[PDB]
Design a protein around this ligand. Structure first.
Ligand code: NI
Ligand code: NI
Length: 256
């Protein structure tokens, strides 16, 4: 029988644990699949081993493993697949599919669009600065830039500047330094993050200093588990379960 195994990265923040668990629970009613389990790589239970084993114990013959990830980096390519292989080696008879992070999807740009609209200031011909966490893995910058291009195509903005909190450039603090001008162009700052936290507070403080220089700057709320993010993730789940060409086939001989 078919199963879905949702995999979040997990958190050490009690609230982040609750938000991720509740989001994954609320996903279940949208998927016409009878066996569905949530799990987390780290810091938070159910572990991946527990959720996978629950799928098998409920009689699953096929397990669609879907990572709750905005972008593609070490978690999606390596850490999570290794945990999958570690537990799945013990059940060699179980067929596995493994999904993609949300990535470049029209729905997440729509989530960004609604975060922009929420400020209530005209966005026509406005600049957008899209802040992702960042990674040394080049796929992350590649995907954030792709999302920026999609936002550019879908919303009548002047330009979209992807930038990052860490690991790869440009850092959002350099972009901010180039935006102290005030040329009459409105600038929206959109944090491309699933959760608030240390980095959101840092962004808040840095945007305050920038607003001290340039009053035409507006910080939106972070993307979070926006309904359009939910739509995009549900797309991922459905495509992983269908696996129509076998493009999501996964083994049990360590692929990462
Ligand atoms: Ni390794
Ligand atoms: Ni909408």
């Amino acid at each position: 029988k078919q199963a879905i195994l949702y995999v979040g990265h997990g958190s050490r923040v009690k609230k982040a644990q609750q938000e991720a668990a509740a989001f994954l629970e609320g996903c279940k009613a949208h998927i016409s699949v009878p066996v569905q389990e949530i799990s987390f790589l780290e810091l938070q239970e159910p572990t991946i081993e527990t959720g996978f084993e629950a799928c098998v114990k409920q009689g699953a013959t096929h397990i669609a493993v879907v990572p709750l990830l905005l972008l593609t980096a070490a978690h999606a390519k390596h850490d999570i697949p290794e945990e999958i292989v570690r537990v799945a080696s013990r059940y060699p008879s179980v067929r596995i599919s493994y999904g993609k992070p949300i990535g470049i999807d029209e729905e997440v740009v729509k989530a960004v669009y609604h975060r922009m609209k929420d400020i209530g200031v005209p966005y026509e011909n406005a600049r957008v600065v899209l802040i992702g966490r960042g990674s040394s893995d080049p796929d992350v910058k590649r995907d954030v830039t792709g999302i920026a291009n999609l936002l550019q195509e879908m919303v009548p903005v002047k330009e979209v500047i992807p930038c990052f909190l860490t690991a790869c450039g440009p850092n959002y603090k350099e972009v901010f330094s180039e935006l102290e001008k005030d040329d009459g162009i409105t600038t929206f700052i959109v944090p491309y993050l699933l959760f608030t936290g240390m980095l959101m507070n840092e962004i808040e403080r840095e945007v305050q200093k920038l607003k001290a220089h340039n009053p035409n700057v507006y910080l939106s709320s972070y993307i979070g588990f926006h309904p359009h993010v939910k739509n995009a993730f549900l797309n991922r789940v459905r495509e992983t379960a269908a696996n129509s060409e076998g493009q999501f086939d996964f083994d049990g001989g360590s692929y990462a």
